[PDB]
């Protein structure tokens, strides 16, 4: 008996490499003979799981039935393959063989006991994730259906000549990735045929001006809103965060610019305050779900400590190109530091005993450190220098109880990542059969083929990084039903299973005399703070385009001196009669502005002169004292990260440490050749007799300054797999990079991304713990079907098909008029007007017979409306939806909880304002001048983000907040002093904006966590 529940566990793993080496390029055929053997393999793996149910069927509920659903799409099968006639379709159903292993695992099935037994709360949420998805559904079918179609095309009667090869609308370089989308005269856009560039003789391309819709939308058709399927897809890329930008840009030059708010909403509601949401509920339930089941006289040991320090220091500076009089002093500096730890080592031998010698757990590590070493001395051993920084451990405590309980950490995860390479790879067998070798096929880097390209693209998708440019190619290949992959991968992966291992790390860790009374009063805190944003104003206002001398130059100069005297007066008035750190913040920037107004003054002294206008920027601050509310949360966010402070001090060694392994492997190596052909290019000189460009990579690891940028880019994992792919494919020094060069490099970019993603997690639960010490039925049936005749409208739908929604529109008024005024009948009067419902309720049908007895008069025709009244009340006919709220009780006590948590959230907003101010500010000041033409070209900018002037700013800096190609503009910043400023510009905006988003977080979730209990 027990022995039969381990060997049943070898047949499977008989049965996952069985499925791994499936090769789906080549077993199109079964005429191989390896293809031969393991179908045998498989006839048998078969035939011992078919009798095993039978000796179970001697003596189910749960596990037995998902283990007899298996052998019976098995049985069915080898049932159709005898008849040798079939489909290809029940191949795919094996991929659920692996499935058996968590009955087998016994710690694998008390696991995934708690994840469904927790999914039931989660229901909710995905009530809430309805509405989000109707609502913003049905309104972009309404405004943008067949608009992403449009071309600029020929004139009807314009007869082109025969030889030109043009394709009769303007194709771009790239017409899937980006066509040129033009407006109609109907709607506003951002674009118009009249800016189509000249051809590069005869040009037919002024000859391109009638805007009309096309055949096909872009990316090979998978972006557009013709139905409430494609506008799912681009909703759900919108939750994502990823390519979300693309997708307004199409909309904002076809439709109309004031589009943006749109985007903005769909983010704020759904991307942030609904996946958020869906990590409280299963960190709530699941931690409810649980509970209801003289070598030592310390100046030789402070002699040590430097010395190892020192040696590690010195490695960081390897620089490439350098002088190698350099090298030669840095090989000298090795025999000096490793004498010196065998000299540490002879005298511990002798003054304490060897016995005691290998007693102490610490001195073991530190001898096998010079057996290494001076063997070294006297590469794969000069990568070995970088483990001498583990010799730290000995000498502070604070870091030792740390890295103790990080590992007692990784004993409680250890059954969750089982689980999570068991979701990995049954994914990767199911893309292998569907997606398989049917993509671009040189073949791009995102195949489905040979299983380890299939592990690191579902591992890719997971990491939400160009997931979109497979889901593209999958769509295009199969059919658009082949979404449902991708969301099935990224719901169940990031947002159930993600936030299960969040769940199981928080349940782991547990004159002189008057002057001083205007000071008291209350409205000189106040007067001064609308002084502050007058201020705001005329920051705000300043952009590069402003004349020297004109109208508005003189009115930004004149406004300096009234705001720099107003604040000096507020200034004196304080040390008189006072006589705290945030009066020292206002009175340097007093003095930062007083010194600007002399310099002014006098006319190098520019260049002087350009660092005190950054230094202006920072005047928006000041009303953090100002404000009672901005003044407790910041002076709480900064006390808050103490606790976790010892989890930075490893996590900033670890950026160091992969830091220099980075250079040690990667020093040189990222140069390419631009040019035509570049296909017979092996080398520089190659590249200087056919006149290409030999460039550097922007993220490159030339020395610790280069790498510890292309780390923080893999970090925040926005643009990290063009870094993985410029490892792997880095030869030699002078070398033409070569595809796929070197394979085993995925152990250096995947290995940095978990270990990142470990530190980050264990830094956000270390401050939550922290801180945590008939008549209704029949409408709700007649809303359900509204839905439905809403969601099938589409473009070009045919006049049956129109007319008949029309009728229904008449039958839906009516009878909310009738079960308004029967409603009325029992209530009179006075209950029809006390409820709020019925207040929301006789709202919706006011505004529905408003806008169906004015939409008759454009049919009548008797007064040529305005068509623009027509369409608004369309889109508000979504309205009738809400009635569902009131039913829909355990969503509403679910939003409840966060309007307690409102204030808090207010607050962290109101900061979150703050840093696009400032930095807002600061773009326009340092990135203004710089363009984006067909002369210079642009990776991340262009005609729609921008630091032009102050608006242009505030909408880049919401595109970098989310993270969605902020690297590409960070790329565009350093093309032409940006090396040093445009690095620190975007790491302290990076890090500040996600530390102020994760704490908007963590107060949700204590007004949550902290309900469970009370
Ligand atoms: C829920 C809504 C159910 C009704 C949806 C519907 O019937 O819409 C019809 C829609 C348009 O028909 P269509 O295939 O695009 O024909 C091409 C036009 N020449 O047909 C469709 O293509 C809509 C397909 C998407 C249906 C929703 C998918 C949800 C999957 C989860
Ligand atoms: C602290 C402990 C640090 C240990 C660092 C160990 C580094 C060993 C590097 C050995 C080496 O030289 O090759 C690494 C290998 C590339 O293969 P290679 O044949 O050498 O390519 C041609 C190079 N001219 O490619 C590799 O396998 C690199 C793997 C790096 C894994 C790092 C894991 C950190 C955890
Ligand atoms: C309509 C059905 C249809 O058109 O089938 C087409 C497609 C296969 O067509 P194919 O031969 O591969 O390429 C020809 C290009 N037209 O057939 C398909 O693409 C069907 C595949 C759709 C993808 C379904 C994915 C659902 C998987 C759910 C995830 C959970 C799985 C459990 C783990
Ligand atoms: C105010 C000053 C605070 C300075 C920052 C201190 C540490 C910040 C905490 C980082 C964090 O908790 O959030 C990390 C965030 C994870 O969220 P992610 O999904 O990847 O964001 C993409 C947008 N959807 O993703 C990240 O961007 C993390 C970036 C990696 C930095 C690791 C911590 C470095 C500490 C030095
Ligand atoms: C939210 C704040 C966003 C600020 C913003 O985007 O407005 C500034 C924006 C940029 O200015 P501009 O360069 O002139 O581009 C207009 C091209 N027609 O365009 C403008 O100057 C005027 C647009 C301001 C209207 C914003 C109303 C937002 C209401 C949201 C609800
Ligand atoms: C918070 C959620 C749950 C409630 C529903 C939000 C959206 C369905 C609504 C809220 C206000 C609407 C926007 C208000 C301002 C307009 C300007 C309008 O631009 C034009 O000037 C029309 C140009 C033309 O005529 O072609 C385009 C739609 C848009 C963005 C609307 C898009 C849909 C919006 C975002
Ligand atoms: C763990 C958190 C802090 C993220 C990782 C920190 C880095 C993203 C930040 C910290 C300070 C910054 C660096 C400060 C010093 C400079 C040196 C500077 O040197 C060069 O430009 C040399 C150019 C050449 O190779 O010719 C390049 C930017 C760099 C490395 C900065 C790059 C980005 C840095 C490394
Ligand atoms: C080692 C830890 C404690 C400091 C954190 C890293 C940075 C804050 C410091 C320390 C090592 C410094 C680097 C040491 C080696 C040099 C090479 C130096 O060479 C050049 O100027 C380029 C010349 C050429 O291109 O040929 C440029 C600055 C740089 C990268 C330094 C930039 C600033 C660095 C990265
Ligand atoms: C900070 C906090 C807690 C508020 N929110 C997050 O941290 C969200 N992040 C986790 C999910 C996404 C990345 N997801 C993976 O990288 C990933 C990779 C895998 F291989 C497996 C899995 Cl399950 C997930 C985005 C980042
Ligand atoms: C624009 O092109 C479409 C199709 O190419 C045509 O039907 C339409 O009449 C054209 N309009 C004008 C004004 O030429
Ligand atoms: C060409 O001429 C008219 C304009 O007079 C244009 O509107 C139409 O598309 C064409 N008509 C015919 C008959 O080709
Ligand atoms: C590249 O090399 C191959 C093999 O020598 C040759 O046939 C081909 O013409 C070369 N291409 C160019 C552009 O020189
Ligand atoms: C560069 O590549 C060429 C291949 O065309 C090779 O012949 C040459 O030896 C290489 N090395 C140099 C020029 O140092
Ligand atoms: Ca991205
Ligand atoms: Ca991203």
């Given at each position: 008996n027990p022995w039969f529940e381990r060997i049943s566990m070898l047949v499977i793993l008989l049965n996952c490499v069985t499925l791994g080496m499936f090769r789906p390029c080549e077993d199109i055929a079964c005429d191989s003979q390896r293809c031969r053997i393991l179908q045998a393999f498989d006839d048998f793996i078969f035939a011992f799981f078919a009798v095993e149910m039978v000796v179970k069927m001697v003596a189910g509920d749960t596990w037995n039935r998902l283990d007899f659903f298996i052998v019976i799409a098995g049985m069915l099968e080898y049932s159709l393959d005898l008849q040798n006639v079939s489909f290809s379709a029940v191949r795919t159903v094996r991929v659920l063989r692996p499935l058996r292993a968590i009955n087998r695992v016994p710690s694998m099935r008390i696991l995934v006991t708690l994840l469904l037994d927790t999914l039931p709360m989660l229901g909710n949420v995905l009530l809430l994730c309805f509405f989000v998805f109707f609502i913003f559904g049905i309104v972009g079918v309404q405004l943008w259906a067949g608009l992403l179609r449009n071309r600029c095309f020929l004139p009807e009667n314009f007869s082109l000549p025969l030889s030109v090869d043009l394709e009769r609308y303007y194709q771009t370089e790239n017409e899937d990735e980006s066509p040129f989308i033009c407006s109609q005269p109907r709607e506003n856009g951002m674009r118009s045929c009249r800016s189509v560039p000249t051809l590069r003789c005869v040009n037919w391309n002024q000859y391109y001006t009638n805007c009309s819709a096309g055949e096909h939308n872009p990316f090979k058709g998978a972006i557009n809103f013709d139905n409430i399927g494609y506008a799912w897809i681009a909703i759900f890329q919108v939750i994502t965060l990823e390519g979300w930008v693309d997708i307004m840009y199409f909309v904002?030059?076809?439709?109309?610019?004031?589009?943006?708010?749109?985007?903005?909403?769909?983010?704020?509601?759904?991307?942030?305050?609904?996946?958020?949401?869906?990590?409280?509920?299963?960190?709530?339930?699941?931690?409810?779900?649980?509970?209801?089941?003289?070598?030592?006289?310390?100046?030789?040991?402070?002699?040590?400590?430097?010395?190892?320090?020192?040696?590690?220091?010195?490695?960081?500076?390897?620089?490439?190109?350098?002088?190698?009089?350099?090298?030669?002093?840095?090989?000298?500096?090795?025999?000096?530091?490793?004498?010196?730890?065998?000299?540490?080592?002879?005298?511990?031998?002798?003054?304490?005993?060897?016995?005691?010698?290998?007693?102490?757990?610490?001195?073991?590590?530190?001898?096998?450190?010079?057996?290494?070493?001076?063997?070294?001395?006297?590469?794969?051993?000069?990568?070995?220098?970088?483990?001498?920084?583990?010799?730290?451990?000995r000498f502070l405590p604070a870091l030792q109880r740390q890295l103790v309980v990080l590992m007692k950490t990784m004993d409680n995860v250890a059954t969750f990542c089982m689980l999570l390479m068991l979701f990995i790879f049954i994914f990767s067998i199911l893309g292998m059969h569907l997606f398989g070798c049917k993509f671009a096929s040189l073949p791009d880097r995102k195949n489905f083929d040979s299983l380890l390209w299939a592990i690191v693209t579902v591992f890719q998708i997971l990491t939400q990084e160009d997931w979109n440019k497979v889901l593209y190619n999958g769509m295009a290949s199969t059919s658009s039903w082949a979404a449902l992959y991708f969301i099935a991968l990224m719901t169940f992966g990031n947002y159930v299973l993600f936030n299960l291992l969040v769940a199981i790390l928080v349940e782991g860790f547990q004159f002189r005399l008057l002057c001083h009374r205007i000071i008291t009063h209350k409205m000189f805190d106040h007067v001064v703070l609308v002084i502050i944003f007058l201020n705001c104003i005329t920051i705000a206002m300043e952009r590069p385009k402003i004349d020297p001398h004109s109208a508005e130059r003189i009115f930004l100069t004149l406004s300096n001196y009234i705001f720099t005297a107003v604040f000096l007066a507020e200034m004196t008035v304080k040390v008189v009669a006072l006589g705290s750190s945030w009066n020292v913040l206002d009175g340097l920037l007093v003095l930062i502005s007083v010194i600007d107004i002399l310099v002014s003054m006098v006319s190098k002294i520019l260049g002087m002169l350009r660092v005190l206008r950054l230094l202006r920027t920072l005047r928006p601050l000041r009303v953090i004292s100002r404000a009672q509310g901005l003044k407790l949360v910041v002076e709480t966010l900064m006390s808050s990260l103490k606790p976790i402070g010892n989890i930075v001090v490893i996590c900033c060694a670890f950026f160091i440490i992969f830091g220099i392994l980075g250079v040690q492997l990667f020093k040189g190596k990222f140069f390419v050749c631009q040019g035509e052909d570049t296909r017979n290019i092996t080398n520089k000189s190659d590249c200087a007799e056919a006149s290409y460009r030999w460039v550097r990579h922007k993220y490159n690891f030339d020395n610790l300054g280069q790498?510890?940028?292309?780390?923080?880019?893999?970090?925040?994992?926005?643009?990290?797999?063009?870094?993985?792919?410029?490892?792997?494919?880095?030869?030699?020094?002078?070398?033409?990079?070569?595809?796929?060069?070197?394979?085993?490099?995925?152990?250096?970019?995947?290995?940095?991304?978990?270990?990142?993603?470990?530190?980050?997690?264990?830094?956000?639960?270390?401050?939550?713990?922290?801180?945590?010490?008939?008549?209704?039925?029949?409408?709700?049936?007649?809303?359900?079907?509204?839905?439905?005749?809403?969601?099938?409208?589409?473009?070009?739908?045919?006049?049956?098909?129109?007319?008949?929604?029309?009728?229904?529109?008449?039958?839906?008024?009516?009878?909310?008029?009738?079960?308004?005024?029967?409603?009325?009948?029992?209530?009179?009067?006075?209950?029809?007007?006390?409820?709020?419902?019925?207040?929301?309720?006789?709202?919706?049908?006011?505004?529905?017979?408003?806008?169906?007895?004015?939409?008759?008069?454009?049919?009548?025709?008797?007064?040529?409306?305005?068509?623009?009244?027509?369409?608004?009340?369309?889109?508000?006919?979504?309205?009738?939806?809400?009635?569902?709220?009131?039913?829909?009780?355990?969503?509403?006590?679910?939003?409840?909880?966060?309007?307690?948590?409102?204030?808090?959230?207010?607050?962290?907003?109101?900061?979150?304002?703050?840093?696009?101010?400032?930095?807002?500010?600061?773009?326009?000041?340092?990135?203004?001048?710089?363009?984006?033409?067909?002369?210079?070209?642009?990776?991340?900018?262009?005609?729609?983000?921008?630091?032009?002037?102050?608006?242009?700013?505030?909408?880049?800096?919401?595109?970098?907040?989310?993270?969605?190609?902020?690297?590409?503009?960070?790329?565009?910043?350093?093309?032409?002093?940006?090396?040093?400023?445009?690095?620190?510009?975007?790491?302290?905006?990076?890090?500040?904006?996600?530390?102020?988003?994760?704490?908007?977080?963590?107060?949700?979730?204590?007004?949550?966590?902290?309900?469970?209990?009370?």
């Open positions: 904002m030059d076809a439709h109309s610019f004031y589009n943006f708010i749109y985007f903005i909403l769909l983010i704020i509601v759904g991307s942030f305050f609904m996946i958020n949401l869906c990590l409280v509920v299963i960190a709530t339930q699941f931690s409810e779900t649980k509970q209801r089941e003289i070598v030592d006289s310390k100046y030789f040991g402070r002699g040590i400590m430097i010395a190892i320090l020192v040696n590690t220091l010195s490695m960081g500076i390897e620089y490439h190109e350098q002088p190698e009089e350099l090298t030669n002093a840095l090989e000298i500096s090795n025999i000096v530091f490793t004498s010196l730890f065998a000299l540490e080592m002879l005298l511990k031998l002798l003054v304490y005993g060897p016995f005691g010698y290998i007693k102490n757990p610490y001195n073991i590590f530190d001898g096998v450190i010079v057996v290494i070493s001076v063997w070294e001395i006297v590469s794969v051993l000069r990568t070995f220098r970088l483990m001498r920084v583990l010799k730290l451990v790498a510890l940028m292309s780390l923080f880019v893999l970090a925040s994992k926005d643009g990290w797999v063009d870094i993985m792919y410029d490892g792997l494919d880095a030869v030699g020094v002078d070398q033409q990079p070569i595809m796929n060069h070197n394979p085993w490099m995925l152990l250096y970019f995947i290995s940095f991304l978990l270990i990142v993603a470990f530190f980050v997690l264990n830094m956000f639960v270390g401050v939550v713990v922290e801180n945590f010490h008939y008549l209704d039925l029949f409408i709700t049936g007649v809303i359900g079907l509204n839905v439905v005749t809403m969601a099938m409208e589409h473009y070009q739908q045919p006049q049956i098909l129109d007319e008949a929604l029309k009728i229904c529109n008449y039958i839906f008024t009516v009878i909310f008029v009738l079960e308004s005024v029967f409603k009325l009948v029992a209530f009179g009067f006075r209950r029809f007007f006390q409820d709020r419902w019925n207040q929301l309720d006789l709202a919706i049908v006011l505004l529905s017979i408003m806008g169906i007895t004015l939409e008759e008069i454009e049919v009548n025709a008797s007064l040529p409306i305005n068509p623009t009244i027509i369409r608004i009340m369309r889109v508000l006919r979504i309205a009738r939806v809400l009635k569902l709220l009131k039913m829909a009780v355990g969503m509403r006590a679910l939003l409840d909880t966060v309007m307690q948590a409102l204030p808090q959230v207010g607050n962290l907003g109101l900061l979150f304002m703050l840093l696009f101010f400032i930095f807002a500010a600061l773009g326009v000041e340092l990135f203004g001048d710089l363009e984006c033409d067909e002369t210079h070209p642009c990776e991340g900018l262009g005609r729609h983000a921008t630091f032009r002037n102050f608006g242009m700013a505030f909408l880049t800096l919401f595109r970098v907040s989310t993270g969605d190609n902020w690297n590409g503009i960070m790329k565009d910043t350093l093309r032409d002093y940006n090396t040093v400023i445009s690095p620190i510009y975007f790491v302290s905006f990076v890090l500040t904006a996600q530390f102020v988003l994760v704490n908007v977080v963590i107060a949700v979730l204590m007004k949550h966590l902290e309900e469970s209990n009370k």
